[PDB]
Amino acid sequence: AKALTERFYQPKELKVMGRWSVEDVTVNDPSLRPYINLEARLLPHSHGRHAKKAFGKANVHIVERLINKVMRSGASSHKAGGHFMRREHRSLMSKKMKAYEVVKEAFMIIERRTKQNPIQVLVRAIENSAPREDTTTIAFGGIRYHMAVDVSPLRRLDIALKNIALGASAKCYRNKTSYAQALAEEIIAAANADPKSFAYSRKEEIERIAQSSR
């Protein structure tokens, strides 16, 4: 950054990025509470070490999961905003340093706004962006019915983070707004639970489709 103290920021306290603490952070959804890691972890970066196991994601910090979802490249095999995005070389895939700075600028943004811990804001956003029921087709005696099902909290997290990031991506695509700004907007919008957020909207639609399916 252009302040030289943000450029050579030195950590001292083991806050997250040496800037934001998590002791004051609380998650009121009990199904997500175990699966949301909020340890005093200075650097979110893990080096893949969790994926080889089945719930290392549970053991993994949450802002790390965010930046990893932000290392995105848009949507290649699906259509967010009705559009394939397909950034190929000008993406952030495998660029976690860029992703880290994107997330950090987003947090700084919202905290300039929102007068709140941005991690608190983020947990609120995934909470009210995370669905509870989905639908899937099951066979009973050989005949398929699009039944409704409940969603496991890990999968709820996965969806929430994914579609937060995807909304940010669609809003930053081919327009004047930055990825960080789109991300900030998406998180606070979802936390306020307004439909402007792609993520809240998507949660509501899969949920109303489920409550239609049963």
Binding site: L42, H45, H47, K96, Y100
Partner: protein
């Protein structure tokens, strides 16, 4: 002149740290950690220091020579080397356990290496394949 040598490895990156009594100066290839330009690399290297605390760092001086692959690998190898240096300088197992529960790979190494590339579109990867 009590000095202690430690070493760290992270995928084609080798750091050699020497630790001794001093003031708190810690240098990576003649350069202060304070000014290492990617924040992430700085933070990888600093984690053991923050975690161990100023109380002992301020009496320690460290110098790391790292001669390998990438900035991140170098940072991790340095992190390893200085973590081991602190532990072997202090003989504090409460600190060893603090590190081992924060990140075990801080003291044990990451054993991972790159998988050899295999024929079909070998330049891309061992499993990356041509299109049908």
């Amino acid at each position: 002149m009590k000095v202690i040598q430690t070493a760290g490895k992270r995928k084609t990156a080798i750091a050699r740290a020497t630790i001794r009594e001093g003031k708190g100066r810690v240098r990576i290839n003649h350069r202060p950690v304070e000014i290492i330009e990617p924040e992430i690399a700085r933070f990888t290297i600093m984690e053991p220091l923050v975690l161990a605390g100023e109380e002992i760092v301020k009496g320690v001086d460290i110098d790391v020579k790292v001669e390998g692959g990438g900035f991140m690998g170098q940072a991790e190898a340095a992190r390893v080397a200085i973590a081991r240096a602190l532990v072997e300088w202090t003989n504090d197992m409460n600190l060893k356990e603090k590190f081992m529960k924060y990140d075990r790979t801080m003291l044990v190494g990451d054993s991972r290496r790159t998988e050899p590339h295999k024929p079909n579109r070998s330049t891309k990867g061992p499993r990356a394949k041509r299109q049908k």
